[PDB]
Structure formats: C-alpha cells, structure tokens
C-alpha cells in the first residue's frame, strides 16, 4: 500500500492526507499574473514552487489538470496604459508575451489552461446574477455591485480572522462602473468591469467544476483575495469551493520587504542576468516553500557553489531506495530541506564510487539523481557546459 502525500492546508493550519475528489485526478487552480509589468522574483518564487508541486504530483502518477489565469482586466493595467499613452489592450497583450518568455526562461511547465479574464465575462455575469438572486450581492448607491460580507458567516475562516455606497466597510466590489474613456463590458447593471476576485471565482469553477482539489497562490493573496473567492463561490454556487489551499511563502530582498515604495523590486529578467536559472531555482526551492526567504548575493552564491559540487560529481560519467526516501521527504508537505540533503547524500556516494573507480555504480546513481533533480528543474545541463 503506497504512502500518501500530506500537504499543509491553509484552511485548517495543518498537514492533511491529500485525498483527490476523483480518484487519481487532481484539479489545480493557481492565481497568475496581472499583465501590466514584468514579473518580479516574488512571482518567480510562486511560479517555481507550484511548478515543483505539479511536477511532483505527476511524478507520483496523478493526472493533474493545471490551470493558471491571466488577469488582463485590472485598474493597474488601465493606469499603466495611460502613463505610456497606449491602449490598455495593447499593454496587456505586450506583457502577456513578456510573461510567456519569462516563464519559458524559468523552464516552468505550461498550464493545461491559461484563461484570461477578458474571455470569461459572461461566466462572471452569471455568477454575480446568482449572488444578487441569493441576496449575497446588492446595488449599490453609486451603481456598483457589492458583496455583502456580513451575510456570509464563514467569512474570514481561510485567514482565521474574526472582525478585521457600501452597507459595510468590509464589503467588496463585484462589478464596478467604467470611467469615461475606459474599456468596459455591458451587463444588466450598467457598463463596467468585474472586480478582481469574482474573476478567479468564475474562471476556476467554470473550468474545473466546483468544488475542486487545490487552489494556490502567493501568501499575500490569502486575504482579501482568496478569502473573497471563497465567499463568492460558496454563496454563489451553494457548494464547497476548494478542498485544499496552498500558499507560497514570501520573498524578501536583503531581509527587507519587497516594496514598490522602497524601490527594491527585482524583475525576473534582472535576476536572470545575474544568475543562471538553475542557480535561481536552487535558491528558491532549497528552503521550505511556506517559509519566508531572503534574496541576496550571498544566498545566490551559496546555491551556485552547491550546484558546482553537483555538476563536478556528474562531469565525466557515462549517460534504488533513494527514490523511496525522496518520496518520503516530498510526501511530508514538500519538505525540500530533507529532499535536498538527500540529493547531497547521493552526491557523496557518487564521489565515493568515482574515487574508488567503480564507474558503473557512479553512473547508475547519477542517472537516478538527475531524475529526482528534474522535479526542481536542476541537474539538466551537460556538466561540461555548466563548468
Ligand atoms: Zn486570483
């Protein structure tokens, strides 16, 4: 009887035995990019973390349906487009292209589905209509459509918080009117645009059905974003939204919060000029995905020397229970610290076989090591190229 995977569920604050709704299948939605600018290393970490999650789940034999959305309806896109004097539609398209190039450069898996908000407006309107019909939504002195949070008594359960033209300050917009000159869509409530959260509620359930297995994103999306998705989807469809919630830890820069106001944001493209993708991945995945991580020259260099050590052991070679122990590490909520230390144990034994001139055994062990490392997107270079 094969060992189960256990994953931390943000909803419950605990590691739970992972149990797919349909046997052997995993439906996964991950919040994606707002396409008004280059993705930064913060996003980079989330992208890499969930790349590892999908790769590992497929490794264990799960059939994974992987969905990641593009947020191409947002005020930042409107704001940014205006500054650059271009149309919002042109800015969005431009940075969707940039996004695909950066993702390719990071060597992440492409999602099976990449829904854009611009193509799911009817689905959003349907959900909003249900919320109005259920009386969880309302207009709206100024014409906007809002969600009535005091009605949803489970509100705040994801983040475990109690009380922290709107009837109530906590209420959030579902459909906002468009300002003159702004892009807009027609609806029964006037020309305007969907709020941010209702976009992901509508796209995810429309594509994956409801409920689905796993919903992911950066920890900063937990509230209000994911919290609001739950309220919308469970009040709106009157059934459970998501079985398990995964949140990727925060990324600091030299121990300081990544902040637009501090001007310390580092784009993925800038990071890839300084480091190789495998060096970036080593740094991003060596710590536990839920813990904060600090981007710095020292921490990158450390991963670079770690990798150097890797490729030296593989260098000249021709092209097990370690696999089992690898599963046991990853099965414990993707415990990469234990998994990485296991890969280094494999390197030590590889070097042993090499020094003792047992080259066959070294080569076979290297094959397995390279296979397991693939899940982290590491050890795929030709050793000579890297060195
Ligand atoms: Zn989202």
List the helices and strands and how they pair.
Blueprint: E1 6-9, E2 14-17, E3 25-30, H1 41-59, E4 63-68, H2 75-83, H3 88-106, H4 121-134, E5 137-139, E6 145-147, E7 172-177, E8 192-194, H5 196-208, E9 212-218, H6 222-237, E10 242-248, E11 251-253, E12 256-257, H7 268-274, H8 277-286, E13 293-295, H9 297-314, H10 321-330, H11 336-355, H12 359-373, H13 383-386
Helix pairs in contact: 2-3, 4-5, 4-6, 5-6, 8-9, 9-11, 10-11, 11-12
Bound molecules: zinc ion.
Residues 31, 200, 225 line the site of zinc ion.
Q: What's the story with the biggest beta sheet?
A: 4 strands, parallel
Total domains: 2
Under the CATH scheme, which architecture of the largest domain would be assigned? 3-Layer(aba) Sandwich
What is the CATH H-level superfamily of the largest domain? HUPs
Helix content: 40-55%
Question: Mind telling me the C-alpha Rg?
Answer: 23 Å
So what's the CATH class of the largest domain? Alpha Beta
Q: Assign an overall shape.
A: globular
N-to-C CA distance: 43 Å
Total helical segments: 13
* Helix-strand string: EEEHEHHHEEEEHEHEEEHHEHHHHH
What portion of the residues fall into strands of 2 or more residues?
A: 5-15%
CATH overall fold name of the largest domain: Rossmann fold
Structural class: alpha/beta
The overall strand count is 13
PDB class: ligase
Keywords: Protein synthesis, Ligase
Assembly: monomeric
Entry title: Structure of the cysteinyl-tRNA synthetase (cysS) from Coxiella burnetii.
